[PDB]
Design a protein around this ligand. Sequence first.
Ligand SMILES: [Mg+2]
Length: 147
Amino acid sequence: MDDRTEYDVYTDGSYVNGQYAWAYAFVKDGKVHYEDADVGKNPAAATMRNVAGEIAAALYAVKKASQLGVKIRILHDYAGIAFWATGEWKAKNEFTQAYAKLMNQYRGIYSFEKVKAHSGNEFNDYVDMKAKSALGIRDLEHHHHHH
Ligand SMILES: [Mg+2]
Protein backbone atom coordinates (compact mmCIF):
# COMPACT_ATOMS: atom_id res chain seq x y z
CA MET A 1 0.00 0.00 0.00
CA ASP A 2 2.43 2.66 1.23
CA ASP A 3 5.47 3.30 3.43
CA ARG A 4 6.98 5.88 5.78
CA THR A 5 10.74 5.43 5.46
CA GLU A 6 13.18 8.34 5.46
CA TYR A 7 16.63 6.75 5.18
CA ASP A 8 18.82 5.33 2.42
CA VAL A 9 18.13 1.74 1.37
CA TYR A 10 20.49 -1.14 2.15
CA THR A 11 21.98 -1.32 -1.34
CA ASP A 12 25.35 -1.02 -3.07
CA GLY A 13 28.17 -2.77 -1.24
CA SER A 14 28.06 -6.54 -0.80
CA TYR A 15 29.99 -9.66 -1.80
CA VAL A 16 31.22 -13.05 -0.60
CA ASN A 17 34.81 -14.19 -1.12
CA GLY A 18 34.97 -12.83 -4.65
CA GLN A 19 31.43 -12.76 -6.02
CA TYR A 20 28.77 -10.07 -6.40
CA ALA A 21 25.36 -9.85 -4.73
CA TRP A 22 22.57 -7.28 -4.52
CA ALA A 23 20.37 -6.69 -1.47
CA TYR A 24 17.74 -4.20 -0.31
CA ALA A 25 15.33 -3.37 2.51
CA PHE A 26 11.57 -3.60 1.99
CA VAL A 27 8.95 -1.96 4.21
CA LYS A 28 5.15 -1.94 3.96
CA ASP A 29 2.72 0.11 6.04
CA GLY A 30 5.77 1.48 7.82
CA LYS A 31 7.11 -1.89 8.94
CA VAL A 32 9.36 -4.72 7.76
CA HIS A 33 7.56 -6.61 5.00
CA TYR A 34 10.33 -8.58 3.28
CA GLU A 35 14.00 -9.43 3.76
CA ASP A 36 16.28 -11.35 1.39
CA ALA A 37 19.16 -10.84 -1.04
CA ASP A 38 20.23 -12.42 -4.33
CA VAL A 39 23.52 -13.46 -5.94
CA GLY A 40 24.50 -13.68 -9.59
CA LYS A 41 26.98 -15.79 -11.54
CA ASN A 42 27.14 -14.45 -15.10
CA PRO A 43 30.60 -13.28 -16.26
CA ALA A 44 29.42 -9.95 -17.69
CA ALA A 45 28.35 -9.12 -14.14
CA ALA A 46 31.10 -11.11 -12.43
CA THR A 47 33.86 -9.35 -14.36
CA MET A 48 33.12 -5.74 -13.40
CA ARG A 49 34.90 -6.11 -10.06
CA ASN A 50 31.56 -7.15 -8.55
CA VAL A 51 30.51 -3.53 -9.08
CA ALA A 52 27.49 -4.41 -11.22
CA GLY A 53 26.13 -6.14 -8.13
CA GLU A 54 26.33 -3.09 -5.88
CA ILE A 55 24.28 -0.93 -8.25
CA ALA A 56 22.17 -3.94 -9.24
CA ALA A 57 20.31 -3.63 -5.94
CA ALA A 58 19.20 -0.07 -6.70
CA LEU A 59 17.84 -1.48 -9.96
CA TYR A 60 15.66 -4.33 -8.70
CA ALA A 61 14.86 -2.07 -5.75
CA VAL A 62 12.94 0.35 -7.98
CA LYS A 63 11.32 -2.35 -10.12
CA LYS A 64 9.68 -3.86 -7.04
CA ALA A 65 9.15 -0.44 -5.48
CA SER A 66 6.38 0.05 -8.03
CA GLN A 67 4.75 -3.24 -7.05
CA LEU A 68 4.52 -2.30 -3.38
CA GLY A 69 3.23 1.10 -4.43
CA VAL A 70 5.95 2.57 -2.22
CA LYS A 71 8.96 4.80 -2.88
CA ILE A 72 12.62 4.87 -1.85
CA ARG A 73 14.89 7.69 -0.67
CA ILE A 74 14.57 10.49 -3.22
CA LEU A 75 14.78 13.72 -1.21
CA HIS A 76 18.45 14.55 -1.77
CA ASP A 77 19.20 10.85 -1.36
CA TYR A 78 22.62 11.08 -3.02
CA ALA A 79 23.97 7.94 -1.37
CA GLY A 80 27.09 6.25 -2.71
CA ILE A 81 25.65 6.35 -6.22
CA ALA A 82 25.82 10.14 -6.18
CA PHE A 83 29.55 9.78 -5.53
CA TRP A 84 30.62 8.86 -9.07
CA ALA A 85 27.51 10.52 -10.49
CA THR A 86 29.50 13.75 -10.30
CA GLY A 87 31.38 12.55 -13.37
CA GLU A 88 34.68 10.79 -12.71
CA TRP A 89 35.00 9.01 -16.05
CA LYS A 90 33.35 8.88 -19.48
CA ALA A 91 30.00 7.10 -19.72
CA LYS A 92 31.52 4.52 -22.05
CA ASN A 93 33.93 3.43 -19.31
CA GLU A 94 32.55 0.23 -17.77
CA PHE A 95 28.99 -1.02 -18.30
CA THR A 96 27.78 1.24 -15.49
CA GLN A 97 26.20 3.34 -18.24
CA ALA A 98 23.34 0.84 -18.41
CA TYR A 99 22.41 2.15 -14.96
CA ALA A 100 21.46 5.59 -16.29
CA LYS A 101 19.42 3.81 -18.97
CA LEU A 102 17.60 1.44 -16.62
CA MET A 103 16.57 4.59 -14.75
CA ASN A 104 13.99 5.84 -17.26
CA GLN A 105 12.98 2.21 -17.72
CA TYR A 106 11.29 2.30 -14.31
CA ARG A 107 11.58 5.99 -13.44
CA GLY A 108 8.60 7.41 -11.58
CA ILE A 109 8.80 6.09 -8.02
CA TYR A 110 12.38 6.99 -7.11
CA SER A 111 14.77 9.84 -7.90
CA PHE A 112 18.50 10.36 -8.46
CA GLU A 113 21.14 12.56 -10.08
CA LYS A 114 23.04 12.16 -13.35
CA VAL A 115 25.24 9.06 -13.38
CA LYS A 116 27.73 8.79 -16.24
CA ALA A 117 29.77 5.66 -15.53
CA HIS A 118 32.88 4.21 -13.89
CA SER A 119 33.36 3.89 -10.13
CA GLY A 120 35.48 2.44 -7.34
CA ASN A 121 35.33 3.39 -3.67
CA GLU A 122 33.51 2.92 -0.37
CA PHE A 123 30.84 5.51 -1.19
CA ASN A 124 28.43 2.57 -1.27
CA ASP A 125 29.45 1.26 2.15
CA TYR A 126 27.96 4.50 3.47
CA VAL A 127 24.53 2.90 3.09
CA ASP A 128 25.64 0.59 5.89
CA MET A 129 25.47 3.30 8.55
CA LYS A 130 22.50 5.05 6.93
CA ALA A 131 20.42 1.89 6.56
CA LYS A 132 21.11 1.22 10.24
CA SER A 133 18.77 4.12 10.99
CA ALA A 134 16.00 2.53 8.91
CA LEU A 135 16.52 -1.02 10.17
CA GLY A 136 16.02 -0.06 13.80
CA ILE A 137 19.00 0.91 15.94
CA ARG A 138 19.32 3.05 19.07
CA ASP A 139 21.71 5.94 19.70
CA LEU A 140 22.20 9.36 21.30
CA GLU A 141 24.09 12.14 19.53
CA HIS A 142 23.76 15.24 17.35
CA HIS A 143 26.27 15.81 14.56
CA HIS A 144 26.62 15.88 10.77
CA HIS A 145 28.61 17.19 7.80
CA HIS A 146 28.18 18.70 4.33
CA HIS A 147 29.68 17.82 0.95
MG1 LIG B 1 20.76 4.20 -2.94
